[PDB]
From Swiss-Prot, chain A:
Forms homodimers and heterodimers with liprins-alpha and liprins-beta. Interacts with the second PTPase domain of PTPRD, PTPRF and PTPRS. Interacts with KIF1A; the interaction decreases in presence of calcium. Belongs to the liprin family. Liprin-alpha subfamily. It comes from the Eukaryota. Expressed only in brain. This is Liprin-alpha-2. The N-terminal coiled coil regions mediate homodimerization preferentially and heterodimerization type alpha/alpha. The C-terminal, non-coiled coil regions mediate heterodimerization type alpha/beta and interaction with PTPRD, PTPRF and PTPRS. It is found in: Cytoplasm; Cell surface; Cell projection, Dendritic spine. The chain holds residues 642 to 670 of 1257 of the full protein. Alters PTPRF cellular localization and induces PTPRF clustering. May regulate the disassembly of focal adhesions. May localize receptor-like tyrosine phosphatases type 2A at specific sites on the plasma membrane, possibly regulating their interaction with the extracellular environment and their association with substrates. In neuronal cells, is a scaffolding protein in the dendritic spines which acts as immobile postsynaptic post able to recruit KIF1A-driven dense core vesicles to dendritic spines.
Swiss-Prot record, chain B:
It is found in: Cytoplasm; Synapse; Presynapse; Postsynapse. Disulfide bonds: none annotated. Phosphorylated on tyrosine residues by PTK2/FAK1 and SRC in growing fibroblasts. It is required for the interaction with NCK2 and for GIT1 recruitment to synapses in hippocampal neurons. Residues 1-123 are annotated as: Interaction with PXN and TGFB1I1. It comes from Rattus norvegicus. Widely expressed. Expressed at high levels in testis (at protein level). Expressed in the brain, including in CA1 hippocampal neurons, in the amygdala, and thalamic nuclei (at protein level). This is ARF GTPase-activating protein GIT1. The coiled coil region mediates dimerization. GTPase-activating protein for ADP ribosylation factor family members, including ARF1. Multidomain scaffold protein that interacts with numerous proteins and therefore participates in many cellular functions, including receptor internalization, focal adhesion remodeling, and signaling by both G protein-coupled receptors and tyrosine kinase receptors. Through PAK1 activation, positively regulates microtubule nucleation during interphase. Plays a role in the regulation of cytokinesis; for this function, may act in a pathway also involving ENTR1 and PTPN13. Forms homodimers and possibly oligomers. May form heterooligomers with GIT2. Interacts with G protein-coupled receptor kinases, including GRK2, GRK3, GRK5 and GRK6. Interacts with PPFIA1, PPFIA2 and PPFIA4. Interacts with GRIP1 and forms a ternary complex with PPFIA1 and GRIP1. Directly interacts with ARHGEF7/beta-PIX, forming in vitro a heptameric complex made of a GIT1 dimer and an ARHGEF7 trimer. Directly interacts with PXN/paxillin; this interaction is enhanced in the presence of ARHGEF7. Directly interacts (via C-terminus) with TGFB1I1/Hic-5 (via LD motif 3).
Amino acid sequence: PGSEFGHSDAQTLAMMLQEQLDAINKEIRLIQEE
Amino acid sequence: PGLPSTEDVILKTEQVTKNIQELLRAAQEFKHDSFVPCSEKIHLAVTEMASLFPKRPALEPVRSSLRLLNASAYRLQSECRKTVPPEPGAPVDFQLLTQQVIQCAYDIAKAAKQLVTITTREK
């Protein structure tokens, strides 16, 4: 299912989105090193 | 058609994340007029990434992640249409809008990450 965020403000959401994007870039980097 | 190469998945994923990154920038810089073109570039990037996988994937996690990816891109497209009301300048709750838009992008990135992981583990 889709994620449930309730009444999270844009600030909190932006942080979690950025964390998600950072995690993607980190995983890709780890893949390209092995 | 089977599972795509890790290199191909990374390429399409990076196009998705780049476009999502630009959307987040628009939200933070209050470029609310840019929400529709950003969502279209994202939706396109999502379509190209999805096309890397079989029309009917064998793997259950691919089916699940593609469902999340596609549904979230569509949901995003639905949300961004509020930045272009038929009467220019009409009342819009930009706080609620931005919240919904970032939620969609979060799940798109989430699904994209899952697909990257799935592809790598099968190689």
